[PDB]
Amino acid sequence: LAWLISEFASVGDVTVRALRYYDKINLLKPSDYTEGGHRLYTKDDLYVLQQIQSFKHLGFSLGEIQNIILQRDIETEVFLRQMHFQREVLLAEQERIAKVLSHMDEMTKKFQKEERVNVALFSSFLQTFIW
Amino acid sequence: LAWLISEFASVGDVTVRALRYYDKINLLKPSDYTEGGHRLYTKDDLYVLQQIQSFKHLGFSLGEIQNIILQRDIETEVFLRQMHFQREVLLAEQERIAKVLSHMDEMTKKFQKEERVNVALFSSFLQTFI
Amino acid sequence: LAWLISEFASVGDVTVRALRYYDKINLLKPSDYTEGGHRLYTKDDLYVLQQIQSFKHLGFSLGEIQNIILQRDIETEVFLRQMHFQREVLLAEQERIAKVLSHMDEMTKKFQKEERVNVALFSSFLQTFI
Amino acid sequence: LAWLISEFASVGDVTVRALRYYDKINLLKPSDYTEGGHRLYTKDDLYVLQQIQSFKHLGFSLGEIQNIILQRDIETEVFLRQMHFQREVLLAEQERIAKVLSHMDEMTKKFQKEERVNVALFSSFLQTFIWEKE
């Protein structure tokens, strides 16, 4: 009762293109085989897929995920550091987006009235939107 | 004013590496060259650099940015519609991040004590939160 | 005929996550709904989606894409100028990878017979590639 | 040897903003500071910077790079395994970019003589072309 590529895609909500990709870089290869070849993914493949999705969610790259998955347990300490790292990346990003939003809402209020703007003048203003 | 690539890089907080790329793809070519090949940047180039920086900030692709920087004036709507859209993009990102951070707290709470974290167990547990 | 978000994900080679996101940021919202209260996509939505996919294939940002579609038709001259730009961007990336790969094989072959790969040294030899 | 943040930025061909960020996420922190508060980067910090760049150049992520730079040396078998995986990612991109350029050459040829590009029509030709050469 293995799955066709298209079935697996629907099941794990991944595009077929993304599956061919993961299979290609050897991050997730379908486990089954009939005769005359043929793909076919299994229920164990789904867990690994879900595993991959769990770590992308946390911000890890295919490289790290590959490393992680190639193990049963990855020892807390080192792992928490890994995840805590991704956390700092997120926090830094959270602060960055907050500012960008503020800069744009600001720029809008400043230029809404203008039918046209000098591209340069509209940059110098956005630039002075830092100390 | 005149800037040798390295001095230009430094004054615009951009790498010498980036400048060579903007030059290659023709996004920002130096207005002048030394007589021995070395490139020389002008104050104008500095504004073009400032501009590339500004619009990249607004979410514009490098291709659209070029077109914009090649016109003195432009219909204000081009920027207005863009920031408006990016605003929604960034708001969805804030939510997406606030959630991920929240999920990490949970993850830390559940395996902070263990000697090892079972990848399969970890993933299924995290999946619970989706 | 129409589709529910799941069947639409299949028709248009995309995911439900993607579709929900597009719905949230108002880049693509379903043209209809079922009495049950579910998203129900039209053949028209399917085409808008195809358009989003295209263009995104080019270095176009979501925001730029919405503008492209709403415009219905765009000036060929400027458009092909942006695509030719992206072409240079892609050719630069293509040659960049070519370099990275050969650098990869050099280092790979050099540290091949060592017991351990000293990170600091590895980096040192790589750097010395000029 | 010692570097202030600007001197250090110029040396590793990295921006000041990038250095502040690395500092913020604990990827690369100044090992010494000035009595007035300014960061003082060391020769040791200089090696870590170059390692970060060397692996960035190879396409590794910052997280991956942190794991790497946190351990002096790695077991050759495993190292190569990791290099090989990354080498595949690069081959995938190389191949993908080749199709894109190709797709763009076709589309350019198609609307080259048209005053306007009809979005919906364009999208149909691009999709038919991508699939046609599947």
Side-chain angles (χ1 to χ4, degrees), chain C residues 25-93:
Chain C
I25 60 173
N26 182 242
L27 180 62
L28 169 66
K29 283 198 159 65
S31 280
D32 230 305
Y33 289 108
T34 80
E35 290 76 298
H38 302 292
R39 304 176 184 173
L40 188 271
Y41 291 97
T42 309
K43 164 192 276 294
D44 293 288
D45 300 327
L46 181 55
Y47 285 113
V48 165
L49 180 58
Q50 159 197 281
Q51 293 160 10
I52 299 183
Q53 298 307 81
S54 308
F55 292 110
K56 170 164 170 294
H57 194 62
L58 320 188
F60 282 106
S61 66
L62 266 32
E64 284 179 87
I65 294 169
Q66 175 164 71
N67 177 61
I68 302 295
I69 299 175
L70 261 16
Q71 230 64 227
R72 295 170 63 189
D73 56 90
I74 61 184
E75 186 193 290
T76 300
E77 216 228 64
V78 160
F79 177 66
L80 295 192
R81 204 201 312 165
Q82 292 170 297
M83 261 210 329
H84 185 257
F85 177 80
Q86 184 67 9
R87 179 192 179 63
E88 295 298 314
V89 164
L90 292 186
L91 282 172
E93 192 44 33

Side-chain angles (χ1 to χ4, degrees), chain A residues 2-128:
Chain A
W3 289 301
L4 291 170
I5 183 74
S6 65
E7 286 186 296
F8 197 62
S10 184
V11 178
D13 196 35
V14 173
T15 60
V16 167
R17 147 176 69 278
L19 283 176
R20 313 277 280 84
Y21 179 64
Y22 292 161
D23 180 14
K24 192 177 188 172
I25 64 176
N26 195 218
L27 167 71
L28 179 58
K29 319 258 293 169
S31 300
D32 276 27
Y33 315 109
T34 52
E35 326 95 300
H38 290 312
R39 294 256 171 171
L40 311 204
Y41 288 88
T42 72
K43 202 167 74 176
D44 273 312
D45 292 326
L46 182 59
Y47 303 128
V48 172
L49 179 61
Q50 303 180 322
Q51 271 155 48
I52 296 183
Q53 286 165 157
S54 284
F55 295 104
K56 295 193 65 171
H57 174 76
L58 297 185
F60 292 98
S61 273
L62 301 184
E64 277 171 289
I65 303 180
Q66 174 66 322
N67 291 329
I68 292 175
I69 276 48
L70 294 179
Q71 299 190 296
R72 190 58 189 178
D73 357 299
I74 190 171
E75 179 194 65
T76 320
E77 44 182 288
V78 162
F79 185 67
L80 293 174
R81 167 181 66 64
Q82 270 195 39
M83 201 198 287
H84 187 250
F85 185 80
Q86 297 305 160
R87 161 165 266 153
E88 301 276 19
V89 163
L90 288 179
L91 293 168
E93 186 54 5
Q94 188 151 63
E95 276 174 45
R96 209 205 95 227
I97 293 175
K99 296 173 183 161
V100 178
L101 281 163
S102 169
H103 298 168
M104 301 194 297
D105 193 58
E106 203 52 44
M107 287 299 278
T108 303
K109 290 176 188 176
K110 255 175 175 289
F111 295 79
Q112 290 190 305
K113 333 294 176 188
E114 308 320 312
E115 288 170 54
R116 317 248 303 158
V117 278
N118 172 260
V119 182
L121 186 58
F122 183 107
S123 177
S124 24
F125 255 98
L126 184 53
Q127 288 288 54
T128 69

Side-chain angles (χ1 to χ4, degrees), chain A residues 16-17, chain C residues 11 13 50 54 57, chain D residues 99 102-103 106-107 122-134:
Chain A
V16 167
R17 147 176 69 278
Chain C
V11 185
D13 308 338
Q50 159 197 281
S54 308
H57 194 62
Chain D
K99 295 182 177 70
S102 169
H103 298 159
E106 188 58 22
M107 291 307 87
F122 180 85
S123 183
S124 287
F125 275 97
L126 177 62
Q127 295 305 155
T128 290
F129 189 65
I130 298 180
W131 186 87
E132 212 156 53
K133 55 170 295 182
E134 176 211 24

Side-chain angles (χ1 to χ4, degrees), chain B residues 23-107:
Chain B
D23 183 3
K24 204 186 186 296
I25 64 176
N26 214 279
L27 185 65
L28 178 57
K29 275 180 154 49
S31 296
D32 273 303
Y33 282 84
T34 214
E35 208 61 0
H38 298 299
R39 56 193 96 181
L40 281 171
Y41 292 100
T42 328
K43 187 71 165 178
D44 304 70
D45 299 317
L46 181 64
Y47 297 131
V48 181
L49 175 44
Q50 270 179 35
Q51 281 151 44
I52 299 175
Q53 293 176 177
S54 295
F55 308 126
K56 207 167 183 172
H57 191 63
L58 303 177
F60 284 119
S61 60
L62 281 197
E64 184 59 54
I65 296 188
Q66 189 189 217
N67 191 201
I68 294 172
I69 295 179
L70 284 177
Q71 311 181 309
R72 291 193 186 181
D73 282 61
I74 192 177
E75 222 258 87
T76 306
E77 240 304 73
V78 180
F79 295 130
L80 290 173
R81 78 160 75 87
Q82 176 62 196
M83 302 192 280
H84 174 286
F85 196 90
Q86 275 297 84
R87 185 196 164 66
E88 304 306 306
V89 168
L90 289 171
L91 282 181
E93 194 48 11
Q94 285 193 301
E95 304 180 6
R96 186 197 146 267
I97 291 175
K99 302 180 186 181
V100 163
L101 286 169
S102 185
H103 292 180
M104 297 187 148
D105 289 322
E106 272 318 320
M107 290 312 97

